[PDB]
């Protein structure tokens, strides 16, 4: 069966959206593919929730190989919250965390949920985002 799963994800970019900025990733998949995509922290929040719906593991009650989702590692809390700051924290955290997902569990790592998560986002499929948007770009690796 042809894999449709990223082997790795790297934090690709920042796009400025409302008091949540949206954060880009680049993931390249076992089929050899490479992708760079934009994501929201709010989008992640759905994404974590969404895996967690597929993974009852989160609390470790069900299994003993069960911390493989050690919930999420997070930097010092809030610091006057700062919604940007939480995206900012989340960017660093999320990349450790996503890297955990591609190592800390196989069972998470391919689940159909994985395929949705790394699948296209319309906002990634929009060449420009609203005028107030600032997009932070990595220097391209490919042509």
Coordinates of C-alpha atoms in Angstrom, one line a residue:
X1 CA 0.0 0.0 0.0
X2 CA 1.3 3.4 -1.0
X3 CA 2.1 5.4 2.2
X4 CA 0.4 8.9 2.5
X5 CA 2.2 9.9 5.6
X6 CA 4.9 12.6 6.3
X7 CA 8.0 11.1 7.9
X8 CA 9.0 14.4 9.3
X9 CA 7.6 17.9 9.9
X10 CA 9.5 21.2 10.2
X11 CA 8.2 24.6 11.2
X12 CA 8.0 26.3 7.8
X13 CA 6.6 29.9 8.4
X14 CA 4.5 32.5 10.1
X15 CA 1.5 34.1 8.6
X16 CA -0.1 37.0 10.4
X17 CA -3.6 36.5 11.3
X18 CA -5.7 38.2 14.0
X19 CA -4.6 37.9 17.6
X20 CA -3.8 34.4 16.5
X21 CA -1.0 34.2 13.8
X22 CA -1.0 31.2 11.6
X23 CA 2.1 28.9 11.5
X24 CA 3.5 27.1 8.6
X25 CA 5.0 23.6 8.5
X26 CA 6.9 21.6 6.0
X27 CA 6.5 17.9 6.0
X28 CA 8.0 15.4 3.6
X29 CA 6.4 11.9 3.3
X30 CA 7.5 8.3 3.1
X31 CA 6.4 8.2 -0.5
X32 CA 9.3 10.7 -0.9
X33 CA 7.0 13.7 -1.2
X34 CA 7.8 17.1 0.4
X35 CA 5.3 19.6 1.5
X36 CA 5.2 23.0 3.0
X37 CA 1.8 24.2 4.4
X38 CA 0.4 26.9 6.6
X39 CA -1.4 26.0 9.9
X40 CA -3.2 27.8 12.6
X41 CA -2.7 27.4 16.4
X42 CA -6.5 27.4 16.5
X43 CA -6.2 25.0 13.7
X44 CA -3.8 22.8 15.8
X45 CA -6.2 23.1 18.7
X46 CA -8.7 21.3 16.6
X47 CA -5.9 19.0 15.3
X48 CA -4.8 17.8 18.7
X49 CA -8.4 17.5 19.8
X50 CA -9.0 15.6 16.6
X51 CA -6.2 13.1 17.1
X52 CA -7.2 12.8 20.7
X53 CA -10.7 11.8 19.6
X54 CA -9.1 9.0 17.6
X55 CA -6.6 8.3 20.4
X56 CA -8.2 7.5 23.8
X57 CA -4.6 7.1 24.9
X58 CA -4.2 10.7 26.1
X59 CA -4.9 9.9 29.8
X60 CA -3.1 6.5 29.8
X61 CA -6.0 4.7 31.3
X62 CA -6.5 2.1 28.5
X63 CA -2.9 0.9 27.8
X64 CA 0.6 0.5 29.2
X65 CA 2.5 1.5 26.0
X66 CA 0.2 4.3 26.5
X67 CA 2.1 7.5 27.3
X68 CA 3.3 7.5 23.7
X69 CA 1.2 10.6 23.5
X70 CA 2.8 12.2 26.7
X71 CA 0.2 14.8 26.2
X72 CA 1.8 18.0 25.1
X73 CA 5.1 19.5 26.4
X74 CA 4.6 23.2 26.9
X75 CA 6.9 26.1 27.8
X76 CA 6.3 28.3 30.9
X77 CA 2.6 29.2 31.1
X78 CA 1.0 32.1 29.5
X79 CA 3.2 35.0 30.7
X80 CA 0.2 37.3 30.5
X81 CA -1.1 34.7 28.1
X82 CA -0.3 36.7 25.0
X83 CA -2.2 35.0 22.2
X84 CA 0.7 35.7 19.9
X85 CA 3.0 34.4 22.5
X86 CA 1.1 31.2 22.8
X87 CA 1.5 30.7 19.0
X88 CA 5.0 31.6 19.5
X89 CA 5.4 29.1 22.3
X90 CA 3.4 26.6 20.4
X91 CA 5.6 26.9 17.3
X92 CA 8.6 25.8 19.3
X93 CA 6.6 23.3 21.3
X94 CA 4.6 22.0 18.4
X95 CA 7.7 21.1 16.5
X96 CA 9.1 19.1 19.3
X97 CA 5.6 17.6 19.8
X98 CA 5.0 16.7 16.1
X99 CA 8.4 15.2 16.0
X100 CA 7.3 13.1 18.9
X101 CA 4.2 12.1 17.0
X102 CA 6.4 10.8 14.2
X103 CA 8.6 9.0 16.9
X104 CA 6.6 8.6 20.0
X105 CA 3.9 6.5 18.4
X106 CA 3.5 4.5 15.2
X107 CA -0.1 4.0 16.1
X108 CA -0.6 7.7 16.2
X109 CA 1.8 8.3 13.3
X110 CA -0.2 6.8 10.5
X111 CA -3.7 7.0 11.8
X112 CA -6.3 8.3 9.3
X113 CA -6.2 11.3 11.4
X114 CA -2.5 11.7 10.3
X115 CA -3.6 11.8 6.8
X116 CA -6.1 14.6 7.4
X117 CA -3.7 16.6 9.5
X118 CA -1.0 16.8 6.9
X119 CA -3.6 17.1 4.1
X120 CA -4.1 20.5 2.2
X121 CA -5.6 23.5 4.0
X122 CA -7.7 26.0 1.9
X123 CA -5.9 28.8 3.6
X124 CA -2.8 27.2 2.3
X125 CA -4.5 27.0 -1.1
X126 CA -5.1 30.8 -1.1
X127 CA -2.1 32.6 -2.7
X128 CA -2.5 35.6 -0.5
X129 CA -4.3 35.9 2.8
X130 CA -6.4 39.1 3.8
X131 CA -4.5 42.4 3.3
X132 CA -3.7 42.8 7.0
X133 CA -1.8 39.6 6.7
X134 CA 1.9 39.3 7.0
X135 CA 3.5 36.2 5.9
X136 CA 6.9 35.1 7.0
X137 CA 8.8 33.0 4.5
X138 CA 11.7 30.6 4.8
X139 CA 14.2 30.8 2.0
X140 CA 13.1 28.0 -0.5
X141 CA 15.1 24.9 -0.6
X142 CA 13.7 23.6 -3.9
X143 CA 13.3 25.5 -7.1

